[PDB]
Write a protein that binds this ligand. Structure first.
Ligand SMILES: Cc1ncc(COP(=O)(O)O)c(CNCC(=O)O)c1O
Ligand SMILES: Cc1ncc(COP(=O)(O)O)c(CNCC(=O)O)c1O
Lengths: 953, 954
């Protein structure tokens, strides 16, 4: 039926053929291994017939890769790049081009995920330790984590930490915090049942000994630098904690929160060399007094020792986190902002304390200069002491000032009260100051104003304490040196530039160059999140197009982009459910059913959304236990708010009767939350919204190619049925309401569409793949997983399978029996894989002592076979131990991983060869050998001796 | 100003570019026993040549503003759809190759693969390039690139002369005009006559024709059978040379199949941007019988010390650095990085993907042709690949008016006809615009329906390609984006580069290639402009040229700069040719003698030979300086016939000559011109200027002194600055005029594009604009400090071979390793390979003095890095002392066994009388977590040349 032109002149390229690893020959061969005639037969045997799409996805014709950037350009060029001096927690900066090119645009940095396998991850672990050290030095607090999502969520994590600490149900918020910070804090509080009160310090009453904590900002949203010593002391005297939202650049010249008693310091690291990104991504910072560390949210790098006593790095105190403690975790956060934390660390390293002081002094002096010019022109400054931010009462019409501002394409903050906020930044030069003085009708140039001329250096607030005294911040100031340091860390880390990283529950698929290109385009990267919307019409088109596509892939009616991780999506989803229930008079329903199979974020998110969790058991086949489910529905039917189902579940299987589960919950007055993170098994085949789900978040960083970034960034947009739409998150600065019916749950992220600048990645993937491609991707994800399962099934037990014996896109290998037979544990297999040139699969989750394997469609048959051959070779190593052919204490498995130092040493007293140690199979060649950089990590020692900043060189 | 007090400059790029800060410099000065930088300079650079007043430059631009500054220029360019053709064709550069290779410092910072054991990645990739060229052209061996199409065609002409010494060369007038101009220029000054003849006009009967050059498809688009022409050539003892197109040859029977001896062209449309002329790797392939006369580098397969199959540069005695004026060419820096881009293109697509692209382009061209015919236009040629020649049925003006409205360029032929060359980028929408331009009142859809699926054009012709290509596994394995990224990273990681450690190559200036400098070269406003557009579409480039010229004139003391020469050697060639044209014009054409000190770089004599000059070597005195007695004697001898001298200053011996003005005066007084090789300007910039002390003309190496990346052996740019008396004779170009006055008397054309590789000039512009006058001076000062610091630290362990008047070197120096041959049976190569174990690429090995090392750190490396290198050399000296004093076996020791591969050091078998730790981690800074492994044992240089294999082995 094709036009003749299409026969003579076919498509230039099909991106699916670049994205999807196995071609026709690979797929036939894998199907032959499975004893199947076709892909359709596989799908038919895997995905329940009754949930499958009736018609193919309705998508636009696929866009050739050689046109995708021009296509996207026609959108991005509709944005306008003004000079934004809005402030409000986002400040333009001069992103060092060397960090941008050698880290952000380097696949050796961005394709790896969370550093669960430390011995092949020491580079990003070191960098994240650098980040923590930097945060602790500058804030003056004892320990910092390895990033939070944004400023607002960090402030909410502070509120919740206070609750966890002293269990008081009142939290005081200074109204001079940024508005979006207040909104996110108020939302978190609302659904956790804590009362917030907006009170100036002088209005705050702690005497009731009923205040969990207080949040204030320094400098505050108006720009003012204030002494909070007395406030903090009053808080402490009544058993309350003190939380300070702050600014790393300001703290380069301001005495920090640590020196005035603050228990928690937090903010955004964005202006340390990361783009505005029209809201993100940015790594937020969070630091606390050592006595609070046990309650820390998120990841934290710690120093430990390896097997030989060498000083090395690992994620510390991991039992705090969602994947261990589930609803009892310190937070729901999983994916964070690792890559951007590392960008900010490299910024601090490149500049040192001396360079950062120089930048900060310059910004402050530019602000002082403008300040004097405006006063001479008859305008009033509301605050005399400030860092980079003025609050101005215009001596003339505000309209006339903004008219001139518009003429020079400059944005200010417009306060409610008719005054203007101006926040200067690293990028502000003489020319900009002259424009600004002209805007305010100051006849005097910047040069002239400077002539007649204090601030922070002349004040009691002058910083007198050192920071970044560690060698790491004093060694890499030449561009040659920073490039070498970045490369050194990169080369310590196994990533998708080396080999398949088959992490179950992570979807480590291709992050394509064409998808990634636009995220550093200025029209995406260099827009302030809070500009007037007529400057971001390109973004608006992007959002509409991606929304429409995601709606079609999922069967939902509306998408909300605000949630900036999967866990945030779950939290937003549940909150929307509760707002829906409240609105319709059913607010008493707070019970959330959660299968024990569901991802750990699910119960943590339900706890964060103030729900009562009822676990639901899973049966022996790996499915939701139908008997228990029916019993828990019956038990809770009066109070039932929701179920959270992961589908297919974390056990790797499709439940045969998921519609029936959805019907049962609906019949008893509850809503269905479906965790969409496993949509890599669904896209183009079935849709959660078709089979009875009400709301689902998606992991754009899993299914839709946003890079794993060493542990972030992510995006967790939620798709909802239209009955939930009126209750979707909005934002106090930029309005997200679609209807007059709107009844927003609140605000879950600091920026209205979260990390907007990385959405182009998923838009590009979707537009290049089209309907046919996206389907093929899912088909091949399922094929690849089942092929691997088939190859391995006689060597390892496949723990769970679907009703006809097939898995989804991932499966579990039950390594548990080897404990009794050979004293071999999952960890031994995981470390030994490193010697075979592979990052382990997901280790000891969701079932202790097992491995969860997810190849993705992006890896080809040869690569799958290398991995299966490694596992089969390892099985034979286990059999050697089982059958007494090798020492059961000293063997490759127990001694893994084998470092370069180990294998090149003059001393060799192992009962196996150096070749068995390091080159166990012929595909592991000296010319492609990736070395674990350290011997086996000591997990216990690190937690018993907690060191979470850079140790002396 | 007080503003600068309150509001200092945001940043100073010099502090990022220059490795040593204040503490490092003071400490190095203390080591030298000197009080200040000025004292060092005063003691080093002769007072009489130094600047009178400081450089007059613009205020330095902060790094955080350089890209906005450059954007104000680049945005003045206009990006049309250019269907001009003429050897440049838009293509779809795979973004993955662009990001993971062109924008990857692990690919682009290294230079020529002189140290094979730490260079197997780019050597493999260049072997891929060669294999690709040989497969597609059907010839036996190909090089690892040339500069451009036109120079490749000229190399072919010269190869023919070298082969049979006949002094007549026949050129088909249907070659591209720029190809013809470069070929005619080469011929003019080599004393070969060229005759422009159609094949039927070509007379070989005299048996006086060296060779013939024709093109397939030709510049008008025609596909022609040249079998008979080639046979006639061969019958009379002549060679046949064919300029061609790698994409066309995906579906056309290739020149190899119709007897051609040499096939050449541009690899540009295999995944490289237009670049407003470059850079692009030219290809050049020959019959096996001609390989000995091959120009440029060529990768060969050999074995390592263990018998493993590995890669090295082969038959190196052909090249300038060995044979000087007797080399097969002057070429040094080529287009390595861009050859590797084109290889990765072919690998990513395979023969099947390339066939797909080629068939699509051809079918688009067939569609367009059928539409134009139906609209009443005449096609001049029925059989073509991608290029039509159209006699408009209506007014050309009316057509071009519509073309302008859709921002589409055609080629405008002299005879009033239009050339249209379609390319990979052409889609339905473009075809529809083109049909509308020609007033067809059809659509591409409609035209397709009228055509049917009758196979027409090349598939339906006797020219259909039937022979396979790219059958090697390398072209059939890496078609997923995941796989190509992994392959590119695998090769990258085999190669030591500036992302690892200092690469102190004498005569290379391995300085910082900064991210900010590099960013713009892949901006579309620089990368995606056809070199031959109307100039009103390239006004940003015009401002770039003006600004860079003005800066270069100020740095050099010259009056005008010409950007056409696309390597240092090409600059030398252009410079000498200009000198000869100047001499010709004033009636002094008899003067052809060029004096060349033996210290001068090997390119100098090769270039003089290429420019038809008689070379008189001049000796060097025991101190390393031009021998005064011999110089005066050679001047006296050649007085009547003296055309030029070529001086490297400071010379390749690493030293400033005390009386260079006197040398210049002597040559001038005897009627000659002074060519000064500016490649060593990193010891001069901001301190002295060649033009201020008697130089008439210099080339610069922008890829040494001015930060263009070394690219694994290219690209470079070799612009020449001249005094105004030489300016009228500067190169022009037949397509885009470079004449300033009616006074112009151009030497000819030396490069295929008027400003050569335009798209990489922004790098040097950016360096200069960020550094300013003060920064550039500091760079030079610190280059000199760093070299002298190293020399001082090493001088009690190694002999420093040459020093200046007061004992100081310039930016580089020579370590005399020769005595260790007698004392320890240790050779320069042993020291070079042993450095690999210490984590360093060797310095320049056995040049310019056999058995020595030449060391150049540059200003970009800091004291800690210099100290690591000196400590390695001191440790190695002690290893030599252990051999000298019989403390270790003289045959089996780390030095003789170097380099130590991963396989070697991890083997179960170890029977060396030294430890694995001494082998691989000889000093504490060489740590397991930073260890760079030589991927192979020591290369066997003899074996490779005795078993010549120059394509991928099975
Ligand atoms: C099934 C599932 N659900 C929820 C999440 C939460 O997404 P965030 O990571 O964006 O908050 C993940 C993340 N998968 C990554 C991992 O488990 O390590 C997941 O696999
Ligand atoms: C002093 C000198 N002169 C001329 C050239 C020739 O420049 P091209 O390579 O651009 O042709 C070089 C190249 N230096 C590199 C080397 O010696 O191998 C050089 O060092």
């Amino acid at each position: 039926a094709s036009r003749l032109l299409e026969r003579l002149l076919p498509r230039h390229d099909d991106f699916a053929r670049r994205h999807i690893g196995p071609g026709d020959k690979d797929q036939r061969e894998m199907l032959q291994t499975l004893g199947l005639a076709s892909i359709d037969e596989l799908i038919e045997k895997t995905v329940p017939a009754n949930i499958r799409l009736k018609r193919p996805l309705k998508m636009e014709d696929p866009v050739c890769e050689n046109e995708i950037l021009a296509t996207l350009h026609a959108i991005s060029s509709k944005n306008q790049i003004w000079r934004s001096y809005i402030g409000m927690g986002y400040y333009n900066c001069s992103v060092p081009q060397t960090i941008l090119r050698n880290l952000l645009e380097n696949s050796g940095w961005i394709t790896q995920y969370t550093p669960y396998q430390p011995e092949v991850s020491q580079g990003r672990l070191e960098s994240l330790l650098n980040y923590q050290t930097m945060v602790c030095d500058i804030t003056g607090l004892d320990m910092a984590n390895a990033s939070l999502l944004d400023e607002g969520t960090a402030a909410a994590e502070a509120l919740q930490l206070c609750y966890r600490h002293n269990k008081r149900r009142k939290f005081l918020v200074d109204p001079r915090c940024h508005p979006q910070t207040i909104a996110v804090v108020q939302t978190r509080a609302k659904y956790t049942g804590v009362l917030t009160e907006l009170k100036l310090p002088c209005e705050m009453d702690f005497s009731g000994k009923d205040v969990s904590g207080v949040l204030f900002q320094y400098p505050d949203t108006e720009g003012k630098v204030e002494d909070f010593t007395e406030l903090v002391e009053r808080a402490h005297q009544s058993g309350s904690l003190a939380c300070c939202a702050t600014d790393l650049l300001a703290l380069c010249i301001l005495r920090p929160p640590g020196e005035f008693g603050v228990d928690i310091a937090l903010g955004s690291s964005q202006r340390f060399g990361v783009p505005l990104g029209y809201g993100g991504p940015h790594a937020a910072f969070f630091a606390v007094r050592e006595s609070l560390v046990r309650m820390m949210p998120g990841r934290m790098v710690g120093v430990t020792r390896d097997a030989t006593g060498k000083e090395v790095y690992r994620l510390a105190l991991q039992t705090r986190e969602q994947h261990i403690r589930r609803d009892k975790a310190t937070s729901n956060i999983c994916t964070a902002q690792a890559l951007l934390a590392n960008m900010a660390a490299m910024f601090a390293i490149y500049h040192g304390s001396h360079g950062l002081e120089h930048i900060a002094r310059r910004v402050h002096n530019a602000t002082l200069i403008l300040s004097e010019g405006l006063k001479r022109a008859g305008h009033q400054l509301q605050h005399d002491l400030f860092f980079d931010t003025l609050k101005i009462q215009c001596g003339c019409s505000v309209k006339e000032v903004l008219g001139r501002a518009a003429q020079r394409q400059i944005n200010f903050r417009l306060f409610e009260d008719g005054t203007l906020g101006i926040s200067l930044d690293e990028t502000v030069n003489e020319k900009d100051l002259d424009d600004l003085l002209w805007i305010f009708g100051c006849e005097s140039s910047a040069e002239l104003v400077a002539e007649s001329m204090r601030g922070i250096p002349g004040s009691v607030f002058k910083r007198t304490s050192p920071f970044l005294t560690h060698q790491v911040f004093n060694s890499y100031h030449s561009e040659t040196n920073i490039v070498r340091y970045m490369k050194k860390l990169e080369n310590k880390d196994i990533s998708l530039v080396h080999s398949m990283i088959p992490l179950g529950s992570c979807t480590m698929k291709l992050n394509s160059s064409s998808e990634l290109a636009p995220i550093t385009w200025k029209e995406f990267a260099n827009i302030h999140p809070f500009v007037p919307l007529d400057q971001a019409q390109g973004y608006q088109q992007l959002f509409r197009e991606l929304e429409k596509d995601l709606c079609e892939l999922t069967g939902y009616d509306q998408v909300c982009f605000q949630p900036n991780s999967g866990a945030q999506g779950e939290y937003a989803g549940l909150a929307t459910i509760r707002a829906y229930l409240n609105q319709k008079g059913e607010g008493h329903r707070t019970v959330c059913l959660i299968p024990k199979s569901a991802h750990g974020t699910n119960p943590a998110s339900a706890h964060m959304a103030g729900m009562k969790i009822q676990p639901v058991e899973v049966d022996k086949y790996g499915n939701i236990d139908a008997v228990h489910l029916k019993a828990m529905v019956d038990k809770h039917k009066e109070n039932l708010a929701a179920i959270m189902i992961t589908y297919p579940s974390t056990n790797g299987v499709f439940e045969e009767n998921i519609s029936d589960v959805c019907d049962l919950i609906h019949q008893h007055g509850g809503q269905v939350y479906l965790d969409g993170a496993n949509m890599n098994a669904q896209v183009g085949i079935c849709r959660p919204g078709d089979f009875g789900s009400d709301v689902s978040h998606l992991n754009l960083h899993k299914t839709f190619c946003i890079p794993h970034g060493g542990g972030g960034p992510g995006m967790g947009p939620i798709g909802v049925k239209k009955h939930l739409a009126p209750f979707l998150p909005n934002h106090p600065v930029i309005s997200l309401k679609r209807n007059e019916d709107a009844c927003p749950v609140g605000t879950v992220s600091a920026a209205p569409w979260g990390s907007s600048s990385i959405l182009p990645i998923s838009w590009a993937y979707i537009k290049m793949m089209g309907g046919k491609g996206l389907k093929q991707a899912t088909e091949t994800a399922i094929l690849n997983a089942n092929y691997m399962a088939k190859r391995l099934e006689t060597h390892y037990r496949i723990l769970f399978r679907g009703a006809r014996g097939y898995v989804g896109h991932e499966f579990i290998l039950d390594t548990r029996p080897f404990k009794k037979s050979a004293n071999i544990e999952a960890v031994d297999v995981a470390k030994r894989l490193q010697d075979y040139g592979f990052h382990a699969p997901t280790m000891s989750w969701p079932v202790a002592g097992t491995l969860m394997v997810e190849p993705t469609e992006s890896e080809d048959k040869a690569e799958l076979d290398r991995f299966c051959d490694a596992m089969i070779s390892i099985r034979q190593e286990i059999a050697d131990i089982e059958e007494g052919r090798i020492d059961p204490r000293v063997n490759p498995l127990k001694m893994s991983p084998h470092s370069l130092t180990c294998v090149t040493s003059s001393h060799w007293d192992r009962p196996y060869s150096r070749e068995v140690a390091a080159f166990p199979l012929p595909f592991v060649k000296p010319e492609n050998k990736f070395w674990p950089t350290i011997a086996r990590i000591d997990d216990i020692y690190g937690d018993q001796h907690l060191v979470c900043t850079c140790p002396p060189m």
